[PDB]
Amino acid sequence: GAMGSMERASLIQKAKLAEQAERYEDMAAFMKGAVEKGEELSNEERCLLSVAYKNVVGGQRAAWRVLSSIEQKSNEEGSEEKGPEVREYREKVETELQGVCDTVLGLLDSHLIKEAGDAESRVFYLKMKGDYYRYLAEVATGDDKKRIIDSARSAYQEAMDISKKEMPPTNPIRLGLALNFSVFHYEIANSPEEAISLAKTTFDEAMADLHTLSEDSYKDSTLIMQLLRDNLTLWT
Amino acid sequence: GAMGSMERASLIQKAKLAEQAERYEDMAAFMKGAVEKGEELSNEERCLLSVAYKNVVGGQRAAWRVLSSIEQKSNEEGSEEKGPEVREYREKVETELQGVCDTVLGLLDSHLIKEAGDAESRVFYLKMKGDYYRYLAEVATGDDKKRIIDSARSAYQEAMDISKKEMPPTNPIRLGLALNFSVFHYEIANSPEEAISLAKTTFDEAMADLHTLSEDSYKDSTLIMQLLRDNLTLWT
Amino acid sequence: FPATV
Amino acid sequence: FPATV
Ligand SMILES: *SCCNC(=O)Cc1ccc(Cl)c(Cl)c1
Ligand SMILES: *SCCNC(=O)Cc1ccc(Cl)c(Cl)c1
Ligand SMILES: [Mg+2]
Ligand SMILES: [Mg+2]
Ligand SMILES: [Mg+2]
Ligand SMILES: [Mg+2]
């Protein structure tokens, strides 16, 4: 693409600059260019990729929710006909969101996942695959909605299986994966009991492993454990 | 452009939706499309146009300042050579900013200003012209930098002359114009004394006119008067 | 909304 | 930075 002529190292440098400038669309385009160089990503570079697209799609999701709310209000009883504009603009944002998700899923499929052999990279990419199918599922309404949901589930499940075999229960990637798969259960799969069970079991097993950790690893793990607790408090 | 096939009213409706969704790039593209329909803008529509581009260029300016700071640190003594990347990316953001300013100035020149006969519209558009030349001046370093600064000054000055003749001293557009022209003096024209004099005289003359106003007009005017006071406190 | 990372 | 509107 348009980044084909820029050095891989320069793309990574500029992704970091874009993050400092809060220019997340730029950050994501730089990291897309870096991935398309075809070399595997380091731990730090995987973080840059995920931060960039998380911020881009997060803004799109927030906007889509605002517009969907307005659209559903317009379809209530006693609401005045305002024309097709709300649906059109919600569809515009929705299409842009789907485009970003398809781009990320394309990077994972070509060819990040198939070259990821270590648990830390493979679980990370499969969690991402689950996340971006989850975002597609949030806006899905058509013939393939169940298949999108199952694509998210399958990716999360493979990541979970690897993480339980190959990572300690305090590993932040394992914890973050469980956090998000639990939200998938609660918000996408209509399975609140599974969501609560997963968050609780993940929290308790991490708690019992904290004694093995340094001060800095303890900080990293307890940060995500608190998010598990926050969700459990929201749900119970 | 790409908005040529959309109804003017639909563009205005979607600009309002984009504002609610905090999608200011979209908002600006919709309002550009509305302006290019060739009809004059109402008071509310002028507000939509200015809010949209103020947010877009405001984000670009914030990003440019972050990158310029990093760039100037890199050029200090004892700083390691990091290559051309910081300058390149600052230039990229700078070029995008200049593009937005040129777009706004193009809308004002073709043909918003020449059709604006009432004081409220003409002063508003000339203030905008001063503002977007001011943003160009913030990043200018070349042969035409003095001419960009004088273009900002000339636009602000014409707006001031009209506002003093045709608007009460509490009029919020007159106040906002004086606020920004004062900042132009302080930050662009190296004239802090003129900046302070203008802010003080504008504040005092508005204060003496508040007694003529309703509760709601009083709220509108005192809001901008407080910004004049905030700047005076910053500068004295 | 619930927390995700 | 100073306030502008
Ligand atoms: S990768 C960005 C830096 N890491 C974090 O902000 C914390 C964190 C922990 C676990 C996981 Cl899976 C993610 Cl994506 C982020
Ligand atoms: S036009 C957007 C609504 N108005 C404001 O937010 C307050 C205000 C007052 C004076 C001026 Cl010149 C501007 Cl641009 C905005
Ligand atoms: Mg190379
Ligand atoms: Mg759709
Ligand atoms: Mg028409
Ligand atoms: Mg330049």
JSON list of N, CA and C in Angstrom, two decimals, chain A residues 8 12 17 41 54 74 77 89 92 94 97-98 102-103 109 122 130 152-153 170 179 222:
[
{"chain": "A", "resi": 8, "resn": "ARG", "atom": "N", "xyz": [10.58, -0.28, 7.44]},
{"chain": "A", "resi": 8, "resn": "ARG", "atom": "CA", "xyz": [9.89, -0.86, 8.59]},
{"chain": "A", "resi": 8, "resn": "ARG", "atom": "C", "xyz": [10.21, -0.11, 9.87]},
{"chain": "A", "resi": 12, "resn": "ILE", "atom": "N", "xyz": [7.62, 1.99, 12.42]},
{"chain": "A", "resi": 12, "resn": "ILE", "atom": "CA", "xyz": [7.47, 1.79, 13.86]},
{"chain": "A", "resi": 12, "resn": "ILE", "atom": "C", "xyz": [7.74, 3.08, 14.62]},
{"chain": "A", "resi": 17, "resn": "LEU", "atom": "N", "xyz": [5.36, 8.00, 17.42]},
{"chain": "A", "resi": 17, "resn": "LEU", "atom": "CA", "xyz": [5.09, 9.44, 17.38]},
{"chain": "A", "resi": 17, "resn": "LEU", "atom": "C", "xyz": [3.60, 9.72, 17.28]},
{"chain": "A", "resi": 41, "resn": "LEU", "atom": "N", "xyz": [6.20, -9.69, 14.38]},
{"chain": "A", "resi": 41, "resn": "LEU", "atom": "CA", "xyz": [6.19, -8.54, 15.27]},
{"chain": "A", "resi": 41, "resn": "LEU", "atom": "C", "xyz": [6.75, -8.91, 16.63]},
{"chain": "A", "resi": 54, "resn": "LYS", "atom": "N", "xyz": [-7.39, -0.51, 18.40]},
{"chain": "A", "resi": 54, "resn": "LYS", "atom": "CA", "xyz": [-8.37, -0.44, 19.48]},
{"chain": "A", "resi": 54, "resn": "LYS", "atom": "C", "xyz": [-8.94, 0.96, 19.61]},
{"chain": "A", "resi": 74, "resn": "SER", "atom": "N", "xyz": [-36.09, 7.26, 16.93]},
{"chain": "A", "resi": 74, "resn": "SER", "atom": "CA", "xyz": [-36.89, 7.71, 15.80]},
{"chain": "A", "resi": 74, "resn": "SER", "atom": "C", "xyz": [-37.92, 6.68, 15.37]},
{"chain": "A", "resi": 77, "resn": "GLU", "atom": "N", "xyz": [-43.01, 4.92, 18.97]},
{"chain": "A", "resi": 77, "resn": "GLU", "atom": "CA", "xyz": [-44.34, 5.46, 18.71]},
{"chain": "A", "resi": 77, "resn": "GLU", "atom": "C", "xyz": [-44.40, 6.94, 19.06]},
{"chain": "A", "resi": 89, "resn": "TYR", "atom": "N", "xyz": [-26.70, 7.60, 7.87]},
{"chain": "A", "resi": 89, "resn": "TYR", "atom": "CA", "xyz": [-25.44, 7.98, 8.50]},
{"chain": "A", "resi": 89, "resn": "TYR", "atom": "C", "xyz": [-24.98, 6.90, 9.47]},
{"chain": "A", "resi": 92, "resn": "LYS", "atom": "N", "xyz": [-23.33, 4.52, 7.29]},
{"chain": "A", "resi": 92, "resn": "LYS", "atom": "CA", "xyz": [-22.02, 4.99, 6.86]},
{"chain": "A", "resi": 92, "resn": "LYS", "atom": "C", "xyz": [-20.96, 4.68, 7.92]},
{"chain": "A", "resi": 94, "resn": "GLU", "atom": "N", "xyz": [-21.24, 2.50, 10.31]},
{"chain": "A", "resi": 94, "resn": "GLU", "atom": "CA", "xyz": [-21.18, 1.04, 10.44]},
{"chain": "A", "resi": 94, "resn": "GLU", "atom": "C", "xyz": [-20.29, 0.42, 9.36]},
{"chain": "A", "resi": 97, "resn": "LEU", "atom": "N", "xyz": [-16.66, 1.10, 10.17]},
{"chain": "A", "resi": 97, "resn": "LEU", "atom": "CA", "xyz": [-16.26, 0.21, 11.25]},
{"chain": "A", "resi": 97, "resn": "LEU", "atom": "C", "xyz": [-15.97, -1.19, 10.73]},
{"chain": "A", "resi": 98, "resn": "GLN", "atom": "N", "xyz": [-16.89, -1.74, 9.93]},
{"chain": "A", "resi": 98, "resn": "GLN", "atom": "CA", "xyz": [-16.69, -3.07, 9.37]},
{"chain": "A", "resi": 98, "resn": "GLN", "atom": "C", "xyz": [-15.43, -3.11, 8.52]},
{"chain": "A", "resi": 102, "resn": "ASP", "atom": "N", "xyz": [-12.41, -5.64, 9.11]},
{"chain": "A", "resi": 102, "resn": "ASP", "atom": "CA", "xyz": [-11.96, -6.53, 8.05]},
{"chain": "A", "resi": 102, "resn": "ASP", "atom": "C", "xyz": [-10.48, -6.35, 7.79]},
{"chain": "A", "resi": 103, "resn": "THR", "atom": "N", "xyz": [-9.99, -5.10, 7.88]},
{"chain": "A", "resi": 103, "resn": "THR", "atom": "CA", "xyz": [-8.57, -4.84, 7.68]},
{"chain": "A", "resi": 103, "resn": "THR", "atom": "C", "xyz": [-7.72, -5.55, 8.74]},
{"chain": "A", "resi": 109, "resn": "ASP", "atom": "N", "xyz": [-4.94, -12.80, 9.36]},
{"chain": "A", "resi": 109, "resn": "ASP", "atom": "CA", "xyz": [-5.01, -13.96, 8.48]},
{"chain": "A", "resi": 109, "resn": "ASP", "atom": "C", "xyz": [-3.88, -14.00, 7.46]},
{"chain": "A", "resi": 122, "resn": "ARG", "atom": "N", "xyz": [0.88, -16.00, 19.77]},
{"chain": "A", "resi": 122, "resn": "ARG", "atom": "CA", "xyz": [-0.28, -16.68, 19.21]},
{"chain": "A", "resi": 122, "resn": "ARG", "atom": "C", "xyz": [-1.55, -16.35, 19.99]},
{"chain": "A", "resi": 130, "resn": "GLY", "atom": "N", "xyz": [-10.66, -12.72, 17.98]},
{"chain": "A", "resi": 130, "resn": "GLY", "atom": "CA", "xyz": [-11.93, -12.75, 18.70]},
{"chain": "A", "resi": 130, "resn": "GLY", "atom": "C", "xyz": [-12.52, -11.37, 18.90]},
{"chain": "A", "resi": 152, "resn": "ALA", "atom": "N", "xyz": [-16.01, -15.33, 16.35]},
{"chain": "A", "resi": 152, "resn": "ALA", "atom": "CA", "xyz": [-15.44, -14.74, 17.56]},
{"chain": "A", "resi": 152, "resn": "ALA", "atom": "C", "xyz": [-15.21, -15.81, 18.62]},
{"chain": "A", "resi": 153, "resn": "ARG", "atom": "N", "xyz": [-16.24, -16.62, 18.87]},
{"chain": "A", "resi": 153, "resn": "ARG", "atom": "CA", "xyz": [-16.14, -17.68, 19.88]},
{"chain": "A", "resi": 153, "resn": "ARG", "atom": "C", "xyz": [-14.99, -18.62, 19.59]},
{"chain": "A", "resi": 170, "resn": "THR", "atom": "N", "xyz": [-1.50, -15.66, 36.03]},
{"chain": "A", "resi": 170, "resn": "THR", "atom": "CA", "xyz": [-1.35, -14.22, 36.19]},
{"chain": "A", "resi": 170, "resn": "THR", "atom": "C", "xyz": [-0.85, -13.52, 34.93]},
{"chain": "A", "resi": 179, "resn": "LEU", "atom": "N", "xyz": [-10.82, -11.66, 30.32]},
{"chain": "A", "resi": 179, "resn": "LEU", "atom": "CA", "xyz": [-11.68, -10.49, 30.47]},
{"chain": "A", "resi": 179, "resn": "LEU", "atom": "C", "xyz": [-12.57, -10.30, 29.25]},
{"chain": "A", "resi": 222, "resn": "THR", "atom": "N", "xyz": [-2.43, -7.34, 38.71]},
{"chain": "A", "resi": 222, "resn": "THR", "atom": "CA", "xyz": [-3.54, -6.86, 39.52]},
{"chain": "A", "resi": 222, "resn": "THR", "atom": "C", "xyz": [-4.33, -5.79, 38.79]}
]
